[PDB]
Symmetry: D2
Subunit: 255 residues, 4 copies
């Protein structure tokens, strides 16, 4: 898995704990050139501090709020103009309101339901469409999902239906972009303490149950997600598309 002369766009770093920063460290250690997108200026500030730990000689940073068609379209356009064609995209982006991540799913508001779909699922579709322009010879797109997309997990509520939606998006993108030699896959990460995890009720309980019940008896971390991202984004996974790899200590496989 040597990645020199490969370029990947990593979307969704907010701070040192981000799953996307685990990917960035692994890709960067494997010699890839990296392009980062962020939403909040605070995330750019963190990226600028975090880039100090990476071997990248150039900070390539773009503000892309995936709610904006304009900003995805012009951001990727700009990316191509600055770094030329790319090899793949790591999508690590999701959002829901706090109100909708605890108590009763049946009480989800329409606006909070469509908000989570728009940011956490649709964003992959329009990103794939725009990123495909920069991959005339093929490439690899990987999104980050959670087991809550496949089963009802307590408290995960609106996010789970948005992850179900994301995991299908991956399948439909895989079929549609296959003839272009663009692979599309998801990683299903086990619970990891991030800024977003703070919004999920019951999160400490979830971690504990993994240590008690998952086959490896331990939690996974961000670098483990990254190592599997390196596989998915690289030629090691030629042949693999429409797939969902659980990086979760085995927990998906047990009841």
């Amino acid at each position: 898995v040597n990645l020199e002369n490969k370029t990947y766009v990593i979307m969704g770093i907010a701070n040192k704990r981000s799953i996307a920063f685990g990917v960035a460290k692994v890709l960067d250690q494997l010699g890839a050139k990296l392009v980062f997108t962020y939403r909040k200026e605070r995330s750019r500030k963190e990226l600028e501090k975090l880039l100090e730990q990476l071997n990248q000689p150039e900070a390539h940073l773009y503000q892309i709020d995936v709610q904006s068609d304009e900003e995805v379209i012009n951001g990727f356009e700009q990316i191509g103009k600055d770094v030329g064609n790319i090899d793949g995209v790591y999508h690590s982006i999701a959002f829901a309101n706090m109100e909708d991540l605890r108590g009763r799913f049946s009480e989800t508001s329409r606006e909070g339901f469509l908000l989570a779909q728009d940011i956490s699922s649709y964003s992959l579709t329009i990103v794939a469409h725009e990123a495909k322009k920069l991959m005339p010879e093929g490439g690899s797109i990987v999104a980050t999902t959670y087991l809550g997309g496949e089963f009802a997990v307590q408290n995960y509520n609106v996010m789970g239906v948005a992850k179900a939606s994301l995991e299908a998006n991956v399948k439909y993108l895989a079929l549609d972009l296959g003839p272009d030699n663009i692979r599309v896959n998801a990683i299903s990460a086990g619970p990891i303490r991030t800024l977003s995890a703070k919004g999920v009720g019951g999160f400490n309980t979830i971690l504990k149950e993994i240590e008690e019940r998952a086959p490896l008896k331990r939690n996974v971390d961000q670098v483990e997600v990254g190592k599997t991202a390196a596989y998915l984004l690289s030629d090691l996974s030629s042949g693999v598309t429409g797939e969902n790899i659980h990086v979760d200590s085995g927990f998906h496989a047990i009841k």
Copy 2:
């Protein structure tokens, strides 16, 4: 036997509607039926289709599931007109036609969100409001297609709306189970309907079923209805969060 049961059926548009299939079966079983429709078309249409049924009266309510207020006032009214209900059959979905062909990667934000709104979110607010009419418990069934589980050619934005609906069912099963409300899905095989006309290559889809599915025949709306009757009754008391394929066994082969 469904005498003294009452079910709300959402999404009859014409004689070919899957929901009319459900209707004829529940009616044949002695249930009292309430209907909800979106446009006045499906109303005059329902007025005439209701003459086939043995319903001694016409409980019709206009509900566009795109409006919270309509879903709310609608179910409140049903509650005043008929009292507590035993279940809801959801048979409602939509996507713009240009989204149901060519390249899924070219889907608009607006069309993606519209399909989610009508085809998946609708079940959540329907269930919240229907719950109010089921203090003793009850049964909610939605209609999905195999396209929510696998990428199918042309089905596109609706495949992601279905994947969403299927998890919606799971999360509603978990939330509503302590209230004794079961929530399930029927994954219907391909049936020629009004909406079925809007999917690219629907005929190639019907023919594949005959050639390849275990029963080597297509299903009809009555078979969906027979399985709705099971899920909506005490025959399925132990069963919730489930997805039952009424598709001649297509789901189980490759």
Copy 3:
């Protein structure tokens, strides 16, 4: 209503057997029932349990599904005694005690193969022999457990037999589909039975259902039997190669 239908129920040992839940329901719905058994002790219990049913006749056949001869000759006798049948409920599994606890990696070859033979192969041969008595189609249902789909502590060799059983249902559905013979499974939640005493930590499993499953209660044998009635009847005519969870929604959560 199942009057003028005939079903063979395989695997009643006592009043707690899942298959006796199936028998009660089907008997209540007016079916003629034929029973098969392995141990003497099980025929005795069967004779006693019949007094609670409305069967005018005791139709009882010893069939140890480890023997081809017994299955072939059992089904042939059944056809001579009662004629053509409408389906078969299979409620048979076995593994050695030390293979339902501890470490799966230490399973013996003879134990693994024993569990496959009785718990999965037996369906294939029963289907072949039963097909002969279903010239116009019918319905076959096997009983499975979520441990065939996931690794469950202590279920061990039986988990692998159930995974084999669940595929056997799909391959049989595809094979026998063109003969209008449907094949399905019910994945039952945990229920206190004689066999359940072989599974390490059973009580803990039961408590986990009550605490975590959507319905927050365990299921019983009659709930299994109600879903069997649906699968074994024309209500489910469109449905084959399917696995219906009767487990209070436990399969749908994590």
Copy 4:
């Protein structure tokens, strides 16, 4: 991925077209020590001739018929004495009579049904048990499966039920061996012209459906399976266990 100082056992090479030989070539490229097990004398012969294509400085060949406990037990024990501890096992073994394979599935004989389970599924359990003794600090076990284990595929018949058994075996082994840090996983390969494929009815029409329908619109090869094996057998896939990775051009994702 770099695999110097790692040792793997590869079971089930018969000739140049065997899936397991694609595994061998990839791992050998990555610097692994490889140890090879075979059943038929003809397979040891092909092995000896195929070894010349490889960088292995040393033939390590062991006859093991997985029908025999003794041969599995003694085989792994001798491997231990010859090479030391190992880092994992690639399992590429299956078998079923022609005479059951070209029946209506409902006509499968008891002895052929159990033969296929014995060789194609049970053998993994016993291999894992014996190989565990050579993995005190952990390691990784990979087995080869096919989509016909998850769905009823025309003609695949008794082997579909065996693959279903194998895929559960993987899960139960993952759970049992997890606390010892041994990961167990499966690769679900797409159709590949092998000696074994020559017993599946209508193999050619299966091949061509892939090209017409699979998102990548093309068939896979042995080397693509090997690259995914290298991933599964290496530290890249820490956190992954009880997983089934489809290497099949995305075919598993479509209907």
